[PDB]
Design a protein around this ligand. Structure first.
Ligand SMILES: *Cc1cc2c(cc1C)nc1c(=O)[nH]c(=O)nc-1n2C[C@H](O)[C@H](O)[C@H](O)COP(=O)(O)OP(=O)(O)OC[C@H]1O[C@@H](n2cnc3c(N)ncnc32)[C@H](O)[C@@H]1O
Ligand SMILES: Nc1nc2c(c(=O)[nH]1)N[C@@H](CNc1ccc(C(=O)N[C@@H](CCC(=O)O)C(=O)O)cc1)CN2
Length: 816
């Protein structure tokens, strides 16, 4: 049994590779072929503790956990094969009041999902885990119906399923080489023979980086070491009739579960103490590594062993049977890379799983859907393989992975900041100047100003679930923009140059707005065939046939990949250049923006010559610039596109020329306060692959009646005719000392009916603003709802948008 032709080749037979093979086969894909080096489970999969919880600290990753567990419950019936899925429930423990607040944070984030999750009192915790030291226990975060599974049995069951639905699993059959073909397909080489695949999928665990390099890519992955300790039989544990639920001791930084009639616990030790396989990056994985472990090192986890011994006293007397030290393939931010890869044809990845056992199931069905449908079934850009780039070096990867390990169980605050591996090489000379004058935020390698320091006010990273040290400074920056004139570093924007004969036709088919006339810029959306908002851009028509597309920092390669695929798919004759790192951008915005800038250029910046949304090349003080009259602040302003090496000089000259006007800096936190007042939607919060543009309120940018048949046009017609079920609305609410940031539950009459997507304090009205999705019948202006913030429901009112009109809209009523 050998197939030389395959629809999809999956490289790697860990839980992830097998799960995917199963889903694709079951979903009806013919000639699915999986190639495994040695045997199924030979990588990290066989050694794992097998914890599978409904809990995730994120958002749509809850779906992945949800689908995994639901699958795992049904595999034994479906395949006729046991999986040893224990489901006593999981409890994360709170021993400080700040950790109780974290649970409240996580509850409002979880109440608008199907995932079942509660905060429980000590009494209840003690009932479920009677061997727990209750001295310090304040609360538990409890997910009933989950637990842990046997990684081997799971993978074996998934393999029988895959085989039952038509998949072919070959091993030993290592992939030794990979050659792309001009038609976009692949020749795959193994010792057993050649497969010509329409697409290939990397699922090769801690060999994923090596497989990537067969096709000239560098996957930012480093294998880390992780240990758990298995205890001998304990009388008090054997005596119990029901299994103990899975714990996490957050302050002690270890997970703990029942294993037979003993216990099993695995620490996440300090980032200073953890160990990883730097040698395996430099030299690759030792060949003949497989089905094997590293030497135990109890000494480096002692601090956490002791915290466990005191928290579960019974450990004190138990003996240790075994210690499992093995490798996990980490990416820098601890999350995997799951999706199709930019800059090559028909290569997909499902790699770098810190938590592969829990993610395998959901990721299989997710990737299957994306592969079969040409768009993801829900948004998981947080796992986009191309959120990383050239900046994500081996040195950055190593240091960030180390930090992500040691940070496994720290308190997760909103607006969290991490400093390992920073700054990357992805900076301009402007970084040296402004680093001491603000809190720099991390954005795909860039250092971007969040908020600026004020004399006689605390500057330090001071994270909180409530308002903190940046609150008043952000208010001043807000004033700065409304009253005077602010300067902001917008350099992180993804920037693409499109030209060639079919430039216009390509864009007209990609985007749902009309293509602007030369000299003009407009806001435009790339929709998926289902009519989901894959991206929000601005399109500048700079010279005939030649365009500049701008998108958010987090959307750079994500968007480029989509655009490049449409170009190749439709045989479009174009040249596409990623110029993200060649150019810097400065936003100058506020009433005195024209005044200040005019001083520095012979170009006429009067409202007469330079209309809103025009784009023009000029010089700002002998520095060449492409200036667009636009601002996501909604106030009068320009964005100044220039060479990266000119950012420092340009900035200097602008701040100098704005002396009179009391020019100053502003950052992204303030920007968010401004755009929200103007009712501007942000991609990733108000819309993404989970939303169509009509429910999100982007009607103004969607031209259904333009001749060209743009992607998603028909789905939109059909959606509109059917009538909307929900609508994005803008909410106001008085709060004590906490602002919505998005992802919070919206309640009405004792039931959750929707969620906030983003938020901010509005300094103009002295109330919190938020965007939220609610059912159409409750989307009327004036409607009262409640927003759940940090354990309290605050009443909220839907308001007429926008709260504040944009400067161009204000200027237009002056005449009228
Ligand atoms: C070490 C560890 C990991 C772990 C854990 C406890 C320990 C001590 N506890 C976990 C837990 O409680 N919950 C959880 O979700 N995960 C846990 N882990 C991590 C888990 O083991 C990994 O995340 C997961 O196993 C990764 O699975 P994946 O399918 O992504 O990768 P793999 O199992 O390593 O499989 C890779 C396979 O690919 C084959 N391979 C390699 N190169 C090739 C080529 N060239 N051609 C074909 N096949 C190839 C390997 O042989 C391997 O089988
Ligand atoms: N370059 C540029 N491109 C961008 C952003 C930017 O920050 N600047 N930011 C991202 C966010 N999206 C928008 C959305 C709307 C506007 C905007 O300005 N809206 C005006 C004008 C719309 C119109 O009438 O054409 C309004 O009043 O609604 C700006 C960026 C995407 N690309």
């Amino acid at each position: 049994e050998w197939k030389d032709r395959a629809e999809t080749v999956i490289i790697g037979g860990g839980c992830v590779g097998v799960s995917l093979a199963y889903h694709l086969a079951k979903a009806g894909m013919r000639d699915v072929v999986l190639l495994e080096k040695s045997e199924l489970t030979a990588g990290s999969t066989w050694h794992a503790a097998g914890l599978t919880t409904y809990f995730h600290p994120g958002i749509n990753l809850k779906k992945i956990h949800y689908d995994s567990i639901k699958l795992y419950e049904r595999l034994e019936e479906e395949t006729g094969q046991v999986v040893g899925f224990h489901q006593p429930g999981s409890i994360r423990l709170a021993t400080t009041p700040e950790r109780v607040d974290e649970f409240k944070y996580q509850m409002t984030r979880t109440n608008w999902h199907a995932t079942e999750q509660y905060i429980i009192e000590p009494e209840k915790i003690h009932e479920l885990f009677p061997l727990l030291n209750m001295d310090k226990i304040l609360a538990g975060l409890y997910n009933p119906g989950d637990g842990h599974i046997d990684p081997y049995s799971l993978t074996m069951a998934l393999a029988t399923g895959a085989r039952k639905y038509g998949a072919l699993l070959k091993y030993p059959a290592p992939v030794t080489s990979l050659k792309p073909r001009p038609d976009g397909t692949w020749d795959v080489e193994t010792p057993q023979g050649s497969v010509r695949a329409n697409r290939i999928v990397n699922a090769a665990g801690f060999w994923a980086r090596e497989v990537g390099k067969m096709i000239g890519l560098d996957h930012p992955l480093i294998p880390v070491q992780h240990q758990y300790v298995i205890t001998s039989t304990i009388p008090e544990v054997k005596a119990l009739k029901r299994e103990l639920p899975v714990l996490r001791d957050l302050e002690g930084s270890y997970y703990l579960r029942q294993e037979r009639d003993g216990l099993l616990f695995g620490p996440y030790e300090s980032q200073e103490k953890m160990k990883l396989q730097a040698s395996w990056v430099a030299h690759g994985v030792p060949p003949g590594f497989g089905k094997e472990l590293f030497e135990s090192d109890l000494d480096r986890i002692t601090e956490h062993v002791e915290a466990a011994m005191e928290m579960v006293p019974v450990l004190k007397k138990a003996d240790i049977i075994n210690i499992v030290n093995g490798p996990i393939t980490y990416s820098p931010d601890i999350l995997p890379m799951v999706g199709p890869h930019q800059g090559v044809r028909n290569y997909w990845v499902a790699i770098g799983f810190g938590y592969g056992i829990i993610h395998a199931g959901g990721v299989g069905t997710y990737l299957s859907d994306w592969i079969l449908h040409g768009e993801p079934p829900f948004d998981l850009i947080e796992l986009d393989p191309n959120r990383y780039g050239k900046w994500t070096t081996t040195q950055y990867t190593e240091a960030k992975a180390r930090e992500s390990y040691g940070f496994n169980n720290i308190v997760g605050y909103p607006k969290e900041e991490r400093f390992a591996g920073r700054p990357t090489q992805r900076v301009s000379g402007l970084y040296k100047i402004l680093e001491s004058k603000c809190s720099m935020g991390f954005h795909a390698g860039w250092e971007q100003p969040h908020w600026f320091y004020k004399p006689g006010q605390d500057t330090q990273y001071r994270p909180s679930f409530r308002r903190t040290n940046w609150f008043e400074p952000v208010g001043s920056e807000y004033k700065q923009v409304m009253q005077r004139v602010g300067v902001i570093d917008l350099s992180p924007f993804g920037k693409f140059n499109i030209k060639g004969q079919d430039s216009t036709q390509l864009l007209d088919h990609l985007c749902a707005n009309v293509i602007p006339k030369v000299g003009f810029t407009n806001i435009s959306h790339m929709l998926t065939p289902r009519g989901r908002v894959y991206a929000e851009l601005t399109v500048s028509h700079q010279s005939p046939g030649e365009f500049l597309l701008i998108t958010g920092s987090g959307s750079e390669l994500h968007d480029l990949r989509w655009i490049e695929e449409a170009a190749v798919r439709g045989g479009y004759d174009v040249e596409i250049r990623n110029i993200t790192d060649e150019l810097g951008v400065l936003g100058v915005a506020g009433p005195y923006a024209r005044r200040v800038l005019q001083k520095l250029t012979s170009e006429d910046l009067s409202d007469d010559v330079f209309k809103f949304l025009q784009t023009k090349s000029l010089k700002i003080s002998d520095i060449p610039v492409t200036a667009i009259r636009i601002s996501y602040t909604g106030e009068l302003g320009w964005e100044l596109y220039h060479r990266r090496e000119d950012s420092a000089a340009l900035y200097e000259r602008i701040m100098n020329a704005g002396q009179e006007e009391g020019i100053d800096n502003f950052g992204t936190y303030a920007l968010n306060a401004l755009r929200l007042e103007k009712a501007f939607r942000a991609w990733g919060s108000e819309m993404n692959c989970d939303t169509n543009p009509l429910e999100a309120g982007l009607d103004y940018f969607i031209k259904l009646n333009k001749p060209a048949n743009f992607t998603g046009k028909q789905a939109l017609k059909q959606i509109k005719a059917k009538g909307l079920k929900r609508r994005l609305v803008c909410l106001t609410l008085a709060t004590d000392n906490v602002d919505p940031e998005g992802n919070e539950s919206v309640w009405y009459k004792g039931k959750v009916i929707g969620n906030t997507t983003s938020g901010s304090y509005s300094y103009s009205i002295q109330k919190s603003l938020a965007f939220a999705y609610v059912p159409v019948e409750l989307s009327e202006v004036g409607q009262q709802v409640e927003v759940e913030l940090l354990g309290k429901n605050y009443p909220a009112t839907i308001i007429q948008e926008p709260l504040v009109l944009t400067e161009p809209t204000r200027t237009r009523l002056q005449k009228d």
